Design an enzyme around this catalytic site. Structure first.
Site, short mmCIF file in Angstrom:
data_model
loop_
_atom_site.label_atom_id
_atom_site.label_comp_id
_atom_site.label_asym_id
_atom_site.label_seq_id
_atom_site.Cartn_x
_atom_site.Cartn_y
_atom_site.Cartn_z
N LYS A 1 23.78 19.16 -0.52
CA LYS A 1 24.52 19.72 0.61
C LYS A 1 24.50 18.57 1.64
O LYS A 1 23.73 18.62 2.59
CB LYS A 1 23.78 20.97 1.15
CG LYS A 1 24.40 21.65 2.39
CD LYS A 1 25.61 22.53 2.06
CE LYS A 1 26.16 23.23 3.33
NZ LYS A 1 27.26 24.19 3.00
N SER B 65 25.72 22.73 8.89
CA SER B 65 25.75 23.19 10.28
C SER B 65 25.27 24.64 10.25
O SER B 65 25.56 25.39 9.30
CB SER B 65 27.17 23.08 10.88
OG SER B 65 28.11 23.93 10.22
N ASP C 21 21.41 26.98 3.32
CA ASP C 21 22.15 26.60 2.10
C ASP C 21 21.37 25.49 1.40
O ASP C 21 21.15 25.51 0.20
CB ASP C 21 23.53 26.03 2.44
CG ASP C 21 24.51 27.07 2.95
OD1 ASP C 21 24.09 28.18 3.33
OD2 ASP C 21 25.72 26.76 2.95
N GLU D 50 27.61 21.12 -2.72
CA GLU D 50 28.29 22.18 -1.97
C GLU D 50 28.92 21.58 -0.71
O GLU D 50 28.31 20.75 -0.02
CB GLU D 50 27.34 23.33 -1.60
CG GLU D 50 28.08 24.46 -0.88
CD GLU D 50 27.19 25.52 -0.24
OE1 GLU D 50 26.02 25.68 -0.66
OE2 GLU D 50 27.69 26.21 0.68
N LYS E 108 30.05 30.32 -1.57
CA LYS E 108 29.80 29.01 -2.17
C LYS E 108 28.31 28.84 -2.52
O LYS E 108 27.98 28.38 -3.60
CB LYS E 108 30.22 27.85 -1.24
CG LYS E 108 31.74 27.72 -0.99
CD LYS E 108 32.06 26.44 -0.21
CE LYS E 108 31.38 26.43 1.13
NZ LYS E 108 31.90 27.54 1.98
N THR E 109 27.43 29.21 -1.60
CA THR E 109 25.99 29.06 -1.82
C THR E 109 25.46 29.96 -2.93
O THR E 109 24.73 29.49 -3.81
CB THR E 109 25.19 29.23 -0.48
OG1 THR E 109 25.57 28.16 0.41
CG2 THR E 109 23.66 29.17 -0.71
N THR F 165 34.97 29.77 4.59
CA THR F 165 33.54 29.72 4.84
C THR F 165 33.12 31.19 4.60
O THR F 165 33.96 32.09 4.67
CB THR F 165 33.23 29.26 6.30
OG1 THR F 165 31.80 29.23 6.50
CG2 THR F 165 33.87 30.19 7.34
N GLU F 166 31.86 31.41 4.24
CA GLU F 166 31.35 32.76 4.00
C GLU F 166 32.01 33.54 2.86
O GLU F 166 32.23 34.74 2.98
CB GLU F 166 31.39 33.61 5.28
CG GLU F 166 30.03 34.11 5.74
CD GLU F 166 29.17 33.02 6.37
OE1 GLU F 166 29.22 31.85 5.91
OE2 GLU F 166 28.45 33.31 7.36
N1 LIG Z 1 27.67 38.28 -4.71
C1 LIG Z 1 27.22 38.63 -3.51
N2 LIG Z 1 26.71 39.85 -3.31
C2 LIG Z 1 26.25 40.24 -2.11
N3 LIG Z 1 26.27 39.42 -1.07
C3 LIG Z 1 26.78 38.19 -1.21
C4 LIG Z 1 27.26 37.76 -2.43
N4 LIG Z 1 27.70 36.52 -2.26
C5 LIG Z 1 27.48 36.16 -0.99
N5 LIG Z 1 26.92 37.18 -0.35
C6 LIG Z 1 26.50 37.16 1.09
O1 LIG Z 1 27.66 36.82 1.86
C7 LIG Z 1 27.28 35.77 2.79
C8 LIG Z 1 28.05 34.48 2.54
O2 LIG Z 1 27.73 33.94 1.24
P1 LIG Z 1 27.35 32.37 1.11
O3 LIG Z 1 26.36 31.97 2.13
O4 LIG Z 1 27.05 32.14 -0.34
O5 LIG Z 1 28.80 31.73 1.49
P2 LIG Z 1 29.33 30.28 1.83
O6 LIG Z 1 30.72 30.18 1.33
O7 LIG Z 1 28.27 29.41 1.25
O8 LIG Z 1 29.33 29.96 3.41
P3 LIG Z 1 29.26 28.51 4.29
O9 LIG Z 1 30.67 28.00 4.55
O10 LIG Z 1 28.33 28.75 5.43
O11 LIG Z 1 28.66 27.32 3.35
C9 LIG Z 1 25.76 35.62 2.72
O12 LIG Z 1 25.05 36.44 3.67
C10 LIG Z 1 25.46 36.07 1.30
O13 LIG Z 1 24.10 36.52 1.17
C1 LIG Z 2 29.17 27.76 10.44
C2 LIG Z 2 29.74 27.75 9.06
N1 LIG Z 2 28.98 28.70 8.17
C3 LIG Z 2 29.74 26.30 8.55
N2 LIG Z 2 28.60 25.99 7.63
C4 LIG Z 2 31.10 25.93 7.95
C5 LIG Z 2 32.28 26.19 8.92
C6 LIG Z 2 33.42 25.20 8.80
C7 LIG Z 2 34.69 25.77 9.43
C8 LIG Z 2 35.80 24.72 9.53
C9 LIG Z 2 37.17 25.32 9.76
O1 LIG Z 2 37.44 25.85 10.86
O2 LIG Z 2 37.99 25.27 8.82
MG LIG Z 3 27.20 27.86 1.82
#
Ligand SMILES: Nc1ncnc2c1ncn2[C@@H]1O[C@H](COP(=O)(O)OP(=O)(O)OP(=O)(O)O)[C@@H](O)[C@H]1O
Ligand SMILES: C[C@H](N)[C@@H](N)CCCCCC(=O)O
Ligand SMILES: [Mg+2]
Ligand SMILES: Nc1ncnc2c1ncn2[C@@H]1O[C@H](COP(=O)(O)OP(=O)(O)OP(=O)(O)O)[C@@H](O)[C@H]1O
Ligand SMILES: C[C@H](N)[C@@H](N)CCCCCC(=O)O
Ligand SMILES: [Mg+2]
EC number: 6.3.3.3
Lengths: 224, 224
Positions: A37, A41, A54, A115, A15-16, A11-12
């Site tokens: 999506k 959560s 997202d 996503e 992906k978004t 996570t983080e």
């Molecule tokens: N290329 C990038 N450059 C700078 N910041 C980024 C970049 N990619 C992602 N971020 C930042 O890092 C954080 C996580 O990115 P993002 O939300 O795309 O991840 P995620 O994998 O979608 O998380 P989730 O599991 O909540 O769906 C966000 O605050 C985003 O703005």
């Molecule tokens: C709060 C977070 N950004 C969610 N959107 C996704 C988190 C899933 C975590 C599941 C795990 O523990 O593997």
């Molecule tokens: Mg995301």
């Protein structure tokens, strides 16, 4: 019509951001796009009910004007695993509803991006994970790799499990979550050798609102 | 004699802290213990050469007085993937040397703990990963799970891959990397159901020098 499931090494990891880049690139190619999506959560309250960032990013980056609910049927306020908050709130996450939502988007889009939530194995109930749904749908998977220490292991683990499930790893996207580090190039070479899928592109470290940055240019859709 | 390989859901999840707890518990049980960190990256200079903190923690927590080199044959200063720094410095990481080091510890210990580096798939060369070595050695594996968002997916991915490699997942250790969060109990229940191995114990959030805290009490060695 074309459909892809976007997962990440965790996570983080981006992906978004990568999904928005993918959506922008498809639009540039001439597709009628839609981001999906199904389960979200970590959402904010609004006059219309709960809204996930997202889901909002995917909605904004779709070439078609889509209703929020069509993009995200399941919205939970608390930022935790979907299965935990779904049980606590007594709002079951149903495979059938998630699948119906995908078909609904396909009524109007010819290129759909889905996503996931968290990583590959994020649970939806005590007996069902997101991976179970992706396998049911036979969706080609795009792996988003946040380039940082520990990402090789995570990319490798995720790629192996996806392939084992009999699914197609359509490609991977390198996302620069942080400013250029010492071993950037070496990590990119290692990741390129190890992930059995084409590198679709690399998103630079974009500090300010990368969800709204013009990133489609970093994706080569012809490799997908 | 008894031997276990300790891996983690990622780098920085607590493999070292849990390994010290495991070592203390074995010592409490009456074993002649030895910690082994064959490959280490992220090390400080000293008059005797480079010294890695994990290796030092394992050495201190061994019941036997061990020489540094016996605990850690390969020490690299830079905190990056072993294969990258090994290639740059022209110091090959050899399976045979890593295996010889394990046998050497077994000359004096009857309970040996081996800490990996990073996660399961950390590369040692362009064609060899740590997982390859663990499989060669047929070592039972203990999975350390840092309890945080994203850990379910990582624990699940790692457990599946380990089992697939034909290896035994001897147990898992829950490590509280941060202070008590909202869904702690729910995450512990989910992790307990999903990881096909006994929960050996849970290490509390110990802010100050947890490598030297008396943590053996949190591990139930009879479940191993
Ligand atoms: N290329 C990038 N450059 C700078 N910041 C980024 C970049 N990619 C992602 N971020 C930042 O890092 C954080 C996580 O990115 P993002 O939300 O795309 O991840 P995620 O994998 O979608 O998380 P989730 O599991 O909540 O769906 C966000 O605050 C985003 O703005
Ligand atoms: C709060 C977070 N950004 C969610 N959107 C996704 C988190 C899933 C975590 C599941 C795990 O523990 O593997
Ligand atoms: Mg995301
Ligand atoms: N239970 C805990 N309570 C408080 N802090 C902890 C706890 N466990 C680990 N930490 C801290 O978190 C950090 C990472 O833990 P540790 O070094 O054990 O992880 P690791 O998985 O061994 O990492 P590496 O891949 O470098 O081998 C350290 O600074 C450690 O002191
Ligand atoms: C610097 C760090 N703490 C190392 N000891 C282990 C890092 C290995 C990361 C490998 C990977 O990218 O999967
Ligand atoms: Mg360690």
């Amino acid at each position: 019509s074309k459909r892809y499931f976007v997962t990440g090494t965790d996570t983080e990891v981006g992906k978004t951001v990568a999904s928005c880049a993918l959506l922008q690139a498809a639009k540039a190619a001439g597709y009628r796009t839609a981001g999906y999506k199904p389960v979200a959560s970590g959402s904010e309250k609004t006059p219309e009910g709960l809204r996930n960032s997202d889901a909002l990013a995917l909605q904004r980056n779709s070439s078609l004007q889509l209703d929020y609910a069509t993009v995200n049927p399941y919205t939970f306020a608390e930022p935790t695993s979907p299965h935990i908050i779904s049980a606590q709130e007594g709002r079951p996450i149903e495979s059938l509803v998630m699948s119906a939502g995908l078909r609904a988007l396909e009524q109007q889009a010819d290129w759909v991006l889905v996503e996931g939530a968290g990583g590959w194995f994020t649970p939806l109930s005590d007996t069902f994970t997101f991976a179970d749904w992706v396998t049911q749908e036979q969706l080609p998977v795009i792996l988003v790799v946040g380039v940082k220490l520990g990402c090789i292991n995570h990319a490798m683990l995720t790629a192996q499990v996806i392939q084992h499930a009999g699914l197609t790893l359509a490609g991977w996207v390198a996302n620069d979550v942080t400013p250029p580090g010492k071993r950037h190039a070496e990590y990119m070479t290692t990741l390129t050798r190890m992930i059995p899928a084409p590198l679709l592109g690399e998103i630079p470290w974009l500090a300010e609102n990368p969800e709204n940055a013009a990133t489609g240019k970093y994706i080569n859709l012809a490799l997908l």
